[PDB]
Amino acid sequence: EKTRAKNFLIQYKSYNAKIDRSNNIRSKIERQIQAIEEGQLISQTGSIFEGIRD
């Protein structure tokens, strides 16, 4: 039933793109958490240097 066979193959690789869609969205958000971790400490560093100045 090679028609149906390649159709299962069509539906088979139909998921793989969707898994990759997830993985890249995960990686993108992990990177954007880190920018709030690193960014948040930089912000406070700026305020004590303001305390030194005044």
Partner 1 sequence: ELKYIATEASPAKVAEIAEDSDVYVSEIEEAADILAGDPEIDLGIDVTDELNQLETELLLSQG
Write the CA distances from 17 to 11, 14, 26, 37, 48, integer angstroms.
11, 6, 14, 31, 48
Interface of this chain with a copy of itself, residues 11 to 50, rule: CB under 8 A: 18, 25, 29, 32-33, 36, 38, 41, 44-45, 48-49
Cβ closest to a copy of itself, residue 10 vs residue 33:
33
**Biggest CA pair distance of the chain:** 81
Asked if 32 is part of the footprint of partner 1 (rule: CB under 8 A), the reply reads yes
Task: Check residue 4 for interaction with a copy of itself (CB under 8 A).
Answer: no
Chain mean position to CA 16 = 18
Q: Applying CB under 8 A, which residues contact partner 1? A: 21, 24-25, 28, 31-32, 35-36, 39-40, 42-43, 45-47, 49-50, 52-53
